[PDB]
């Protein structure tokens, strides 16, 4: 089963070259009193985070960002941390001998 899964994601990666296999996902706080103060990968970016940089939901989906309109921000720091994450990724993206990015994008 380990060999089967590696073969499936090798074929998928050629079919989308040079797009990476993953979407850019947000940074969120692990949820309980036991796990706050550390971050993890979330599901999608909010529309308030997207309003910060200047992308619509349809527009950001096109260049590889996952968008989750069901999530709502709980504080002002949640927005600044993820707007900075959106701003950075738009720098390191080029739109058409090209490099395909491996693993999770911006761990």
């Amino acid at each position: 089963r380990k060999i089967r899964r590696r073969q499936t994601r090798l074929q998928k990666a050629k079919a989308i070259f040079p797009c990476p296999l993953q979407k850019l996902r947000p940074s969120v706080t692990r949820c309980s009193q036991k796990f706050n103060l550390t971050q993890r990968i979330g599901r999608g970016f909010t529309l308030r985070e997207l309003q910060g940089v200047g992308l619509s939901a349809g527009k950001a989906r096109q260049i590889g960002i996952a968008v989750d309109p069901r999530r709502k921000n709980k504080s002002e720091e949640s927005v600044a941390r993820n707007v900075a994450r959106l701003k950075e990724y738009l720098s390191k993206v080029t739109i058409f001998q090209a490099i395909q990015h491996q693993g999770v994008v911006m761990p």
Binding site: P18, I63, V93, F96, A98, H101
Partner: peptide, 12 residues
């Protein structure tokens, strides 16, 4: 037709 399919590359 709005929002087509696009090729792009990300960098490390």
């Amino acid at each position: 037709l709005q929002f087509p399919k696009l090729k792009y590359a990300v960098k490390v």
